[PDB]
Design an enzyme around this catalytic site. Structure first.
Site, PDB file in Angstrom:
ATOM      1  N   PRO A   1      80.689  49.658  54.680  1.00 29.82           N
ATOM      2  CA  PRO A   1      80.873  49.107  53.316  1.00 29.82           C
ATOM      3  C   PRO A   1      79.986  47.894  53.063  1.00 29.82           C
ATOM      4  O   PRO A   1      79.530  47.238  54.000  1.00 29.82           O
ATOM      5  CB  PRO A   1      82.340  48.731  53.167  1.00 29.82           C
ATOM      6  CG  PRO A   1      83.004  49.611  54.231  1.00 29.82           C
ATOM      7  CD  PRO A   1      81.988  49.775  55.369  1.00 29.82           C
TER       8      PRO A   1
ATOM      9  N   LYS B   1      87.454  49.661  58.532  1.00 34.14           N
ATOM     10  CA  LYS B   1      86.211  49.910  59.254  1.00 34.14           C
ATOM     11  C   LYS B   1      85.923  48.792  60.248  1.00 34.14           C
ATOM     12  O   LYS B   1      86.378  47.661  60.078  1.00 34.14           O
ATOM     13  CB  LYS B   1      85.044  50.027  58.269  1.00 34.14           C
ATOM     14  CG  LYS B   1      85.247  51.057  57.173  1.00 34.14           C
ATOM     15  CD  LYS B   1      85.330  52.469  57.732  1.00 34.14           C
ATOM     16  CE  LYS B   1      85.596  53.477  56.623  1.00 34.14           C
ATOM     17  NZ  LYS B   1      85.690  54.872  57.142  1.00 34.14           N
TER      18      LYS B   1
ATOM     19  N   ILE C   1      82.121  54.308  51.363  1.00 32.90           N
ATOM     20  CA  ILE C   1      82.289  55.753  51.408  1.00 32.90           C
ATOM     21  C   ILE C   1      83.775  56.002  51.623  1.00 32.90           C
ATOM     22  O   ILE C   1      84.288  55.833  52.728  1.00 32.90           O
ATOM     23  CB  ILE C   1      81.474  56.374  52.566  1.00 32.90           C
ATOM     24  CG1 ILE C   1      79.988  56.050  52.384  1.00 32.90           C
ATOM     25  CG2 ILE C   1      81.675  57.884  52.592  1.00 32.90           C
ATOM     26  CD1 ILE C   1      79.144  56.259  53.631  1.00 32.90           C
TER      27      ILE C   1
ATOM     28  N   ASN D   1      83.159  45.278  40.597  1.00 34.75           N
ATOM     29  CA  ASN D   1      82.928  46.699  40.384  1.00 34.75           C
ATOM     30  C   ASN D   1      83.056  47.447  41.701  1.00 34.75           C
ATOM     31  O   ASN D   1      82.371  47.126  42.671  1.00 34.75           O
ATOM     32  CB  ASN D   1      81.532  46.936  39.800  1.00 34.75           C
ATOM     33  CG  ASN D   1      81.437  46.544  38.339  1.00 34.75           C
ATOM     34  OD1 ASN D   1      82.393  46.699  37.581  1.00 34.75           O
ATOM     35  ND2 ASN D   1      80.278  46.029  37.938  1.00 34.75           N
TER      36      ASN D   1
HETATM   37  C1  LIG Z   1      79.114  55.779  61.517  1.00 39.48           C
HETATM   38  C2  LIG Z   1      77.962  54.852  61.906  1.00 39.48           C
HETATM   39  C3  LIG Z   1      77.854  53.604  61.023  1.00 39.48           C
HETATM   40  C4  LIG Z   1      77.063  52.553  61.473  1.00 39.48           C
HETATM   41  C5  LIG Z   1      76.913  51.407  60.699  1.00 39.48           C
HETATM   42  O1  LIG Z   1      76.214  50.478  61.104  1.00 39.48           O
HETATM   43  N1  LIG Z   1      77.556  51.302  59.460  1.00 39.48           N
HETATM   44  C6  LIG Z   1      78.357  52.356  58.999  1.00 39.48           C
HETATM   45  N2  LIG Z   1      79.086  52.510  57.898  1.00 39.48           N
HETATM   46  C7  LIG Z   1      79.668  53.702  57.985  1.00 39.48           C
HETATM   47  C8  LIG Z   1      80.660  54.237  56.948  1.00 39.48           C
HETATM   48  O2  LIG Z   1      81.139  53.462  56.122  1.00 39.48           O
HETATM   49  C9  LIG Z   1      81.061  55.715  56.920  1.00 39.48           C
HETATM   50  C10 LIG Z   1      80.202  56.701  57.395  1.00 39.48           C
HETATM   51  C11 LIG Z   1      80.562  58.044  57.315  1.00 39.48           C
HETATM   52  C12 LIG Z   1      81.786  58.404  56.760  1.00 39.48           C
HETATM   53  C13 LIG Z   1      82.649  57.420  56.285  1.00 39.48           C
HETATM   54  C14 LIG Z   1      82.287  56.080  56.364  1.00 39.48           C
HETATM   55  C15 LIG Z   1      79.325  54.316  59.115  1.00 39.48           C
HETATM   56  N3  LIG Z   1      78.506  53.508  59.782  1.00 39.48           N
END
Ligand SMILES: CCc1cc(=O)nc2[nH]c(C(=O)c3ccccc3)cn12
Lengths: 117, 117, 114
Positions: C1, C32, C64, C97
Site C-alpha cells: 500500500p 500488510k 490492492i 481519497n
Molecule cells: C508480495 C510482494 C510485495 C513486495 C513489496 O515490496 N510490496 C508489496 N505490496 C504488495 C501488496 O500490497 C499485494 C500484492 C499482491 C496481492 C495483494 C497485495 C505485495 N508486495
C-alpha cells in the site's frame, strides 16, 4: 470536491486571489457548497508537455458525482479559461483528469461520506 | 498519456534530458504521438518505502486505453529500467499506479476527448 | 500500500518519527507487512479548504484490496487522528481519497502484482 493544479509556471506568476477564484468558481460549477471545496496549486514543477517545457499544467478534479460527459467538457472550458487568463497557460498544454469518487471512497472528519450502512 | 514520478532523489541527480527521454520512450511504448505525452518529475521528496529512506519512487501512468495486464508488465520493465539507470533507484523500491482513463474523463484544450456525443 | 499526504503545514512542524509512525500504523491497519508500505509527506503546500488556508490536508491511500465501506471509515479515523495529533490539522479539513487498485495496475520490481 478537490482540484489540484501542478504547473511549471513559477510561484511568483500565480496571482493574488487565484485559490479563492478557483474555490468560488468550482463551487458554482459543481453545485456543491464552497465550504466543501478544496484547492491545491503546485508551481515551479519540472514537467514537459509534448516534449516542450513551455508553460503547461497537469490537473485533477475529484467530486462525488457531478462528473460526466457534458459536465466535464464544461469544467474543462472553465478551468482552461482560468489557467489561460491567470497563469498564461495555453489550453492545449493542459490535462485535467476527472474522477467520479464513490462516497465510501472519500474520507473526511474521521469517517467517510458513506454513512448509510 | 501522463507519467508522474515522485522521488526522494535530489534534483541535481535528475539528468538533463530525462523528461525528453521519458517522453520519447513513452510515445514508443504506448504508440501515442509525442505531442500528447506529458511528463512530470518531482525530486527531493520526503518519502519512505518499507520504512527506509533509501532511494525510491512512487509513480503514476494515465492513458486512454493501452492499459492492461501484459502492457503494464511491459511498462513496468521499461520505467523501472529508466529509473534505475538514470536515477539509480532500485526496481524493488518503485511503485507505479496504472490508470486506464475514459476519454470523457480527460480534459484538454477547453474540452475533453469525448467529442462524439 | 501507499499513502500520500499533501499539506500546507510547514516542514518544520512535521515531527521526527512521522513517516515511521505512518508506516507501522498503516501496516497494522491494512494487515500488510511494514516492508510493503510506502509513505510520502508533502509539507508547505499552497492550498485552501472551504476558502480558508488554515491547516488542511489532501491525502490518498492506494491498496490492492483492503478498501471498502467500514475499512475506509476505520482508516479515516486512524489517519485523521494522526494528522490532528502530529500536525495539528482539524479532521474536518482533511480529505482522503481511497483507491482499490487492481493487482495488474500496480507496477513493482520490473513487473506487476498480477
Ligand atoms: C508480495 C510482494 C510485495 C513486495 C513489496 O515490496 N510490496 C508489496 N505490496 C504488495 C501488496 O500490497 C499485494 C500484492 C499482491 C496481492 C495483494 C497485495 C505485495 N508486495
Amino acid at each position: 470536491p478537490m482540484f489540484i493544479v501542478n504547473t511549471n509556471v513559477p510561484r511568483a506568476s500565480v496571482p493574488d486571489g487565484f485559490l479563492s477564484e478557483l474555490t468560488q468558481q468550482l463551487a458554482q460549477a459543481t453545485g456543491k457548497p464552497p465550504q466543501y471545496i478544496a484547492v491545491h496549486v503546485v508551481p515551479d514543477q519540472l514537467m514537459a508537455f509534448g516534449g516542450s517545457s513551455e508553460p503547461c499544467a497537469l490537473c485533477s478534479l475529484h467530486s462525488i458525482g457531478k462528473i460526466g460527459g457534458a459536465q466535464n467538457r464544461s469544467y474543462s472550458k472553465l478551468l482552461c479559461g482560468l489557467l489561460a487568463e491567470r497563469l498564461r497557460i495555453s489550453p492545449d498544454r493542459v490535462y485535467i483528469n476527472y474522477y467520479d469518487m464513490n462516497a465510501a471512497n472519500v474520507g473526511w472528519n474521521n469517517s467517510t461520506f458513506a454513512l448509510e450502512h
